[PDB]
């Protein structure tokens, strides 16, 4: 014997109630609160059944009910300074209670469980199962509706005082259901139903109360720049409001609330933002719609159907001399495929699909374009090109630069791919080529030999 069973619950409840209300528990008495609980659990007179577990459930439910009395009459900014201060005074406090009753946490709780019954937990995990007597009581309606009031200070309110909110969110994650199962992934089950579900519904409203209030008083060119800030700001309102598992799901429901449901006046503004030489707005604009799918391919036809309404304007301003002036019909189209090449290079991040816009759309103003129509021949377009390359690759006053001899031909190679009908080029090139070779009217024989080498690369 040497222990007893009722002498213990007259001095144990003098430090078990003094470890709570933390008051510098000396190590000199900690081992006295162990020697009791240890002796209580090693005797036969027989661990006095399970009473100590029950008596340790009443005291916790008395420090958690006599304490609810102060706090459940409090409005915002006060229940948020009560469930962040007296949570660190129960997480810390009931962790000394996890090693004062160590001998009741190792043998009986692992032998009283894994046998014949339930409702047996480690005393620490018992504390945060009876902590759902102050949570399924205010808080779940009184901080969740209060944290949102604080988190809804994105507008102007600085000094959010993150510390209070960080305590709340980490509390819900920590309160993850350890009831039953075993002491095994994550515990984000009491987080979804109390600070994720009722945080997203209240983050749609704050944004669809500024989205269609800013595109009614300001142009679209500022929604294209607020979006980037807010979509980035709601990626830094994580990592201080946390446990993650919300970055990939808050961002999406901040992305169809800003630009996926306003994709009606973006295409309309796209046209306006395309006649102008504006080149930085499209980059931000492309970035916004880069995140959204199903619509990256809609603002892809408009650009494809803008160079074509731009290509038959420059060769239209070429005039009438274009028929009997070979360089003009080549330089003009080349200018069109210089400026809008940079657009599909700098602005839209050299997208492979967007290159297709700078592609065949360019083909459809080189095959059946003007000038060719006027002197009706689809075959005419190669001929003007054919004369151009020969025009420069001829014996003349003087071949001025060896570099210009490559780059112009290299530039010629670019527009070659789009003509869609090679045959005429081989004819007209060869005919006057024969005149060239017979009379030796060419300089730097390698350059032309380089041209068929480029032709060897081509068809």
């Amino acid at each position: 014997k040497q222990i007893g069973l009722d002498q213990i619950w007259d001095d144990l409840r003098a430090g078990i109630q003094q470890v709570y209300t933390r008051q510098s528990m000396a190590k000199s008495r900690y081992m006295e609160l162990y020697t009791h609980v240890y002796n209580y659990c090693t005797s036969v007179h027989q661990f006095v059944g399970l009473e100590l577990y029950k008596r340790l459930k009443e005291f916790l439910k008395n420090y958690l009910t006599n304490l609810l009395k102060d706090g459940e009459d409090l409005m915002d900014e006060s229940v948020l300074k009560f469930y962040t201060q007296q949570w660190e005074d129960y997480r810390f406090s009931s962790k000394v209670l996890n090693g004062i009753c160590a001998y009741l946490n190792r043998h009986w709780v692992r032998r009283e469980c894994d046998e014949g019954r339930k409702g047996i937990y480690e005393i620490y995990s018992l504390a945060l199962v009876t902590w759902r007597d102050c949570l399924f009581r205010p808080l779940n309606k009184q901080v969740t509706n209060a944290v949102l009031k604080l988190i809804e200070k994105e507008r102007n309110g600085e000094t959010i005082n993150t510390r209070l909110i960080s305590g709340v969110v980490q509390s819900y994650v920590e309160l993850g259901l350890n009831e039953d199962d075993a002491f095994a992934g994550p515990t984000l089950t009491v987080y979804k139903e109390s600070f994720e579900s009722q945080f997203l519904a209240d983050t749609e409203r704050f944004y669809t109360r500024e989205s269609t209030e800013f595109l009614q008083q300001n142009p679209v060119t500022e929604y294209m720049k607020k979006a980037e800030a807010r979509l980035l700001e709601e990626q830094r309102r994580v990592q201080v409001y946390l446990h993650e598992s919300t970055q990939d799901e808050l961002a999406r429901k901040c992305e169809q609330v800003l630009i996926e449901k306003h994709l009606e006046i973006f295409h309309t503004e796209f046209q306006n933002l395309l006649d102008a030489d504006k080149n930085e707005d499209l980059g931000r604009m492309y970035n916004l719609v880069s995140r959204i799918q199903d619509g990256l391919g809609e603002l892809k036809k408009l650009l494809e159907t803008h160079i074509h309404n731009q290509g038959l304007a420059a060769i239209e301003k070429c005039g009438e001399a274009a028929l009997n002036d070979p360089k003009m019909y080549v330089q003009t189209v080349l200018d069109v495929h210089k400026k809008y090449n940079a657009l599909v290079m700098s602005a839209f991040n050299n997208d492979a699909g967007f290159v297709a816009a700078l592609d065949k759309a360019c083909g459809r103003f080189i095959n059946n374009n003007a000038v060719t129509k006027m002197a009706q021949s689809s075959s005419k377009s190669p001929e003007l090109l054919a004369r151009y390359c020969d025009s420069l690759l001829k014996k003349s006053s003087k071949n001025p630069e060896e570099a210009e001899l490559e780059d112009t031909l290299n530039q010629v190679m670019v527009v070659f791919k789009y003509i869609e009908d090679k045959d005429v080029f081989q004819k007209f090139y060869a005919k006057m080529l024969a005149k060239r070779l017979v009379h030796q009217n060419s300089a730097s024989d390698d350059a032309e030999a380089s041209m068929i080498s480029k032709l060897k690369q081509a068809c």
């Binding site: 090693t42 005797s43 036969v44 043998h107 032998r111």
Partner: protein
């Protein structure tokens, strides 16, 4: 006079972390020390969820009267740690003959050492392929003609129930009405997941077709078949029949539980070298069968081995542990093959549509593997 008249007789937690550091046989000796020790013995004999295997290698060909396997099982059972409940042992077909057959002497010898309550199935094959004692990292050794054998000790595992079955042949009778499939549990069992059908003395006509008929009764379910044809039987614990050596039949284990995962790969005539064999066992790895608490099986044909793959041996065994890092391996060489391609787990079943009748089971000149995850 010392303190532990109190301590060693009242303190429960100290009598528990003592009887764990004892051989299994001693654990049932101290079970009658006093009344508290009994409870401690039962608790310790319940945290036993590991299968233990005993084998007899070729390096113990002692030139003395006695079976090699019986000698090892005599010495090793003293140091065994778990209490065996069901046991499956195989040995080569020269260690059960003393005059022309003798068979009882070798058989009952092993049938005596094992506990009376334990269930023993005795099967003899022409060839034993076995992993030696120790850990799960031992390199498997493939033994053709030569005295070798292994014994598998299955302890009491919660939620998993294993029951042997035996259908003797007949001179003239019915086939199987219904009840023998319910007596042992091959039918009407919602949790049958692995079966290990074996067959013996199938040489005679009708008996060769007996294995054809008996399997179809309990086939077509979401179970894994495995095994083949062997020589003869040695010992079965049914307590109602003196075993007849001349009669043929079908015997095997019938695994049943809620967490018994399985896997099976056929090795057809399309594998003839190291790279092809490793490709086949890579498919087994893709089944995501867990590593721990699994035992592997390999049933092959006597025409495969040294002769079939050019001048090499231990080739299937080496490839098994090439991709599976610590699983053991046990299997026999026989004159028949049973199996298909199929994975059954807690969720998914990957049967072969095999729409003809049942022509996806009885192969010849091939090898079958298995990954029976006994436990969880």
């Amino acid at each position: 006079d010392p303190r532990s008249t109190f301590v060693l007789s009242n303190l429960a937690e100290v009598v528990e972390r003592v009887l764990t550091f004892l051989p299994a046989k001693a654990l049932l000796r101290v079970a009658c020390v006093c009344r508290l020790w009994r409870e401690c013995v039962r608790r310790v004999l319940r945290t036993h969820r590991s299968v233990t295997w005993i084998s007899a290698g070729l390096a113990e060909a002692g030139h003395l009267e006695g079976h090699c396997l019986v000698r090892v099982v005599a010495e090793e059972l003293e140091n065994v740690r778990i209490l065996p409940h069901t046991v499956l042992y195989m040995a080569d077909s020269e260690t059960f003959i003393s005059l022309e057959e003798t068979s009882m002497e070798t058989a009952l010898a092993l049938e005596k050492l094992f506990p009376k309550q334990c269930q023993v199935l005795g099967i003899v094959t022409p060839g034993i392929v076995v992993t030696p004692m120790g850990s799960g990292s031992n390199r498997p050794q493939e033994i053709e003609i030569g005295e070798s054998g292994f014994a598998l000790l299955f302890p009491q595992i919660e939620g998993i129930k294993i029951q042997p079955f035996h259908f003797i042949k007949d001179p003239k009778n019915l086939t199987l009405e219904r009840h023998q499939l319910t007596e042992v549990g091959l039918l009407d069992n919602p949790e049958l997941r692995v079966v290990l059908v074996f067959g013996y003395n199938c040489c005679k006509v009708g008996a060769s077709n007996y294995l054809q008929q008996v399997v179809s009764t309990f086939s077509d379910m979401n179970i894994i078949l495995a095994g083949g044809q062997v020589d003869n039987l040695s010992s079965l614990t049914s307590e109602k029949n003196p075993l007849d050596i001349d009669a043929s039949g079908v015997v095997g284990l019938s695994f049943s539980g809620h967490r018994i995962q399985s896997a099976t790969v056929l090795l057809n005539e399309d594998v003839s070298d190291e790279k092809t064999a490793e490709a086949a066992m890579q498919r087994l790895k893709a089944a995501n069968i867990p590593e721990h608490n699994t035992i592997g099986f390999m049933f092959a044909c006597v025409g495969r081995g040294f002769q079939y793959y050019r001048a090499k041996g231990n080739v299937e065994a080496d490839a098994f542990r090439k991709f599976f890092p610590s699983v053991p391996l046990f299997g026999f060489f026989g004159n028949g093959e049973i199996g298909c391609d199929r994975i059954v787990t807690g969720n998914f079943i990957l049967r072969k549509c095999n729409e003809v009748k049942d022509d996806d089971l009885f192969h010849s000149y091939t090898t079958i593997m298995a990954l029976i995850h006994l436990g969880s």
